[PDB]
RNA sequence: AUAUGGAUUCUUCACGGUAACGUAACUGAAUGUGGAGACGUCGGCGCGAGCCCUGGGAGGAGUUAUCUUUUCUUCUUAAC
């Protein structure tokens, strides 16, 4: 009956990431010491990869497949859950409550997320997650 | 016309905030969409400015047989 789990894919509705697809890593159903509301820890895409055709060269294909990730704590009311899923075990440990409140630790976590997303995009799977929403 | 400083990049084209949004900056051609320019009249109410009225004090002037701590006057601050 509960669908907000550690593999659910959601759509951000507010906060400079509106219209970006995101995946839930760690949910907190009953608030916390900070953020006194239902919220989840998510990792998403800030810059979707561009479309690739057969005419593009090797140097151009690699440039158009770059993905810029982000990490954010989002209220439940600002998320639109979907029916799609994406396993987060490759970067579940690095993204946690401790990775915040530290400028340097946030950068290291996002580098791990970028590696996982780029490998996920290669050998195409989770195609709906890597396709930008049009609105 | 152009240099310097700052900002950005070895995760190439910035970060923060749950959010409304914030900042010294923080690539964007064709094409497309939207906003501003851009609007009647009357009625009462709220607020601002200039003026009017008035107290104390620091100056100048007038009246003074008698009365009047009194009558008149100066005390200002632009765009940006």
Alpha-carbon Rg of chain A, whole angstroms?
15
- Tally of domains within chain A: 1
Query: Which secondary structure element, helix H or strand E, spans residue A43, and what is its range?
Result: strand A39-47
CB distance A35 to A42 below 8 Å: no
Method: cryo-EM
Positions 78-107 in A, CB within 7 angstroms of strand B = 78, 100, 103, 106-107
Range of the domain at A34: 1-135
As ranges, strand B nucleotides with an atom below 7 A of a protein CB are: 11-22
What is the CA A58 to C1' B29 distance in angstroms? 24
CB A48 within 8 A of CB A30: no
For residues A117 and A113, what is the distance between their CA atoms, to the nearest angstrom?
Answer: 6
- Give distance CA A4 / C1' B58 (Å): 78
Pairing of strands A21-28, A8-12: antiparallel
Report resolution (Å) to 1 decimal. 2.2
Q: How far is the C-alpha of A101 from the C-alpha of A31, rounded, in Å?
A: 17
- Considering only residues 31-50 of chain A, list those whose CB is below 7 Å from strand B: 34-35, 37, 39, 47
Straight-line distance from CA A51 to C1' B44, in Å?
64
């Amino acid at each position: 009956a509960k669908f907000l789990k550690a593999g659910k894919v959601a759509v951000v509705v507010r906060g400079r990431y509106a219209g970006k697809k995101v995946v839930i890593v760690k949910p907190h159903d009953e608030g916390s010491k900070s953020h006194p509301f239902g919220h989840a820890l998510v990792a998403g895409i800030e810059r979707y990869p561009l479309k690739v055709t057969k005419k593009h060269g090797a140097k151009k294909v690699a440039k158009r497949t770059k993905i810029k990730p982000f990490i954010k704590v989002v209220n439940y009311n600002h998320l639109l859950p979907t029916r799609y899923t994406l396993d987060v075990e490759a970067f579940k440990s690095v993204v946690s409550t401790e990775t915040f409140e530290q400028p340097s630790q946030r950068e290291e976590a996002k580098k791990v997320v970028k590696k996982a997303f780029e490998e996920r995009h290669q050998a195409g799977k989770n195609q709906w997650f890597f396709s930008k929403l049009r609105f």
